């Protein structure tokens, strides 16, 4: 009897059947990824289909234990993450239509071909193509073409499919007792009934719009600096009070300003620290890199690698014709089996990617004792916020000279710290308005505030107001510019990249205060310190066991995300920019336009 006691013996058999089938699926997928052939695509979707039906039936069986009569927290959190219907609450033909739309939307993006108006025999794909034209080219009209042609070729097929995808997604989300599909997405940062750690779905919007009001004083000065620097690369094409043309920001959509570093480098001839000739003159390899990445975690107070990690991972490209899709990843196949798949070359970028990727294996090893349904980060933007602080610490010019890659007599000056901080700001603080504005447009368009005849109007109005860029070519209601992004045409949430950027610096300031650091925050190092490893391990080991607002409390001492550490990391750059824009005009006007002149 005691319905709470039958759920315990149901989750007692699930936790084993699932743990046995998931390992099969994961190993079958690894065997394909590391080695592509004709049957390793068959016996991998075989295991995927055998693991999906199991879960789809175990949910039907778990629909029998009402979440009311349950009283424990772990069993409730496990049943609540297994009772979710998702799809298969729609009709059968409506689900078929939704799946067809979702599969037709991604192949218009994957196989998009933009043709040259002068030589339309051969055309260009996106990646080996427009993605490098928008990166390196310094011609105005060439970039204008590469932008408009892609937004008008793959921008007008996704519109009549996105119009229906919105409706079907809303109809699905309202059948799961949400109010729209935006609320379904925000229902990941939701905590209910913990008496002092609650977090409603309606508070994420408020918190995001409340933290974005303190980044504007820094984004405005960065915008003014980059505008005054771009006025010299394309003279007479930019107004000194207006916004920036939306096709000069360094890539296809303007998500990262990192390619603007060659034009807007603060101090002239002062190359920033790059240990890549020291590596090849000291004869490193793909083994020494990982052996040096592991000694860091062992010094900080964390375990070794499991010795099954060393003889099962694939960290080198297979020299022969053994084609493998290698994009650095950390696998967690289960049953204590951790592996890493990446094509390691002897560069400092791989030296930092190794630390990043092993920061995931450490997180995975931490919570490996939880039940099967509670092995994940506290929420969406935790598993990467944890990986990024390791690579933040491993690249300082003080950890490099104590590792044998930077001459001892090397002396750093502020004229290179400014360069490092500006190169960091173009990537970190350059994407926050873009992320916030995109996920605000999506929420508003899902809730029904933006009617279907005012999509591009509000899109470009917000692009001019919030992020401060203006379109070069007018766009009527036949376009869909947001759907020209990988995460929009492929149905992905896009707010984890906003919360991760704040969790990262919260964690860094919380940890590197326990290391008793003295100078600025962008010089912190957590090596040779166990008070930081033991403070991070007290959060790494929980998983989804406790609410994310309690996992945050353990490390940083606060119960929400804060933007003060992110502003305290860029204080030198802010002080430099502030008394460098005295002759410029901080801010922009939303009336200028590069076509109405």
């Amino acid at each position: 009897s005691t319905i709470e006691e039958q759920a315990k013996t149901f989750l007692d058999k699930f936790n084993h059947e699932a743990e046995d089938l998931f390992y099969q699926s994961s190993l079958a997928s690894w065997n394909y990824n590391t080695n592509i052939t004709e049957e390793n695509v068959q016996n991998m979707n075989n295991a995927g289909d055998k693991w999906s039906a199991f879960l789809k039936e175990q949910s039907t069986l778990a629909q029998m234990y009402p979440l009311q009569e349950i009283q424990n927290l772990t069993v409730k959190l496990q049943l609540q993450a297994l009772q979710q219907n998702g799809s298969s609450v729609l009709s059968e033909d409506k689900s078929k239509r939704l799946n067809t739309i979702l599969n037709t939307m991604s192949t218009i993006y994957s196989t998009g071909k933009v043709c040259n108006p002068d030589n339309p025999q051969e055309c260009l794909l996106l990646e080996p193509g427009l993605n490098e034209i928008m990166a390196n080219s310094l011609d105005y009209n060439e970039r204008l073409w590469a932008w408009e042609s892609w937004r008008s070729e793959v921008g007008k097929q996704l519109r009549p499919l996105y119009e229906e995808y919105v409706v079907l997604k809303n109809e699905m989300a309202r059948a799961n007792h949400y109010e729209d599909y935006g609320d379904y997405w925000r229902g990941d940062y939701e905590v209910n009934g913990v008496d002092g750690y609650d977090y409603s779905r309606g508070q994420l919007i408020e918190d995001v719009e409340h933290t974005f009001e303190e980044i504007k004083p820094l984004y405005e000065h960065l915008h003014a600096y980059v505008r005054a620097k771009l006025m010299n690369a394309y003279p007479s094409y930019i107004s000194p009070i207006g916004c920036l043309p939306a096709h000069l920001l360094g890539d296809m959509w303007g998500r990262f300003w990192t390619n603007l570093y060659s034009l807007t480098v603060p101090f002239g001839q002062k190359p920033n620290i790059d240990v890549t000739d020291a590596m090849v003159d000291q004869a490193w390899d793909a083994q020494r890199i990982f052996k040096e990445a592991e000694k860091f975690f062992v010094s900080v107070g964390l375990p070794n690698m499991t010795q099954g990690f060393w003889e099962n991972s694939m960290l080198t490209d297979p020299g022969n014709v053994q084609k493998a899709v290698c994009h650095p990843t950390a696998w967690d196949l289960g049953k204590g089996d951790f592996r890493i798949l990446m094509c390691t070359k002897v560069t400092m970028d791989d030296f930092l990617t190794a630390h990043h990727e092993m920061g995931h294996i450490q997180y995975d090893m931490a919570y490996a004792a939880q039940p099967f349904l509670l092995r994940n980060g506290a929420n969406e933007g935790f598993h990467e916020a944890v990986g990024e602080i390791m690579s933040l610490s491993a690249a300082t010019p003080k950890h490099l000279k104590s590792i044998g890659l930077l001459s001892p007599d090397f002396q750093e000056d502020n004229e290179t710290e400014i360069n490092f901080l500006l190169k960091q700001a173009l990537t970190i603080v350059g994407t926050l308005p873009f992320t916030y504005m995109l996920e605000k447009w999506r929420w508003m368009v899902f809730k029904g505030e933006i009617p279907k005849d005012q999509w591009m109007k509000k899109w470009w109005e917000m692009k001019r107001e919030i992020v401060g860029v203006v379109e070069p070519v007018p766009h009527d209601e036949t376009y869909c510019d947001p759907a020209s992004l990988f995460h929009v045409s492929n149905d992905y949430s896009f707010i984890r990249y906003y919360t991760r950027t704040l969790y990262q610096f919260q964690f860094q300031e919380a940890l590197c205060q326990a290391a008793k650091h003295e100078g600025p925050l962008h010089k912190c190092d957590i090596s040779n310190s166990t008070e930081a490893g033991q403070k991070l391990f007290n959060m790494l080991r929980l998983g989804k066991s406790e609410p994310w607002t309690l996992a945050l409390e353990n490390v940083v001492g606060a119960k929400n995300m804060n933007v003060r550490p992110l502003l305290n990391y860029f204080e030198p750059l802010f002080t430099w920019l502030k008394d460098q824009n005295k002759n410029s005009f901080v801010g922009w006007s939303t009336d200028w336009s590069p076509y109405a002149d």
Binding site: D12, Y23, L27, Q307, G308, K335
Partner: protein, 97 residues
Amino acid sequence: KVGGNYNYRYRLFRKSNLKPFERDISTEIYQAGNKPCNGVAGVNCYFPLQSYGFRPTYGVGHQPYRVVVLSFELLHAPATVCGPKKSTNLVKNKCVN
């Protein structure tokens, strides 16, 4: 076994804990609900013996281990098993102990 060695099983559900040095081999279907199921698996009626899926690419602590527990007792019989008595050389024509 590469592919899984399911020959090894173990019991997962029992009504009441065992006794010291007791052994159960029952294969009756455990009942976690309030309705009988008449020896048929299904809802709230589980098969009590799950299997170990030993594969070689596991992690230490999930790999198989062979265990041998020994137990000594002296009930009432005034002789039985005991270890070896060592004997050294032997000299002659000397007063010895």
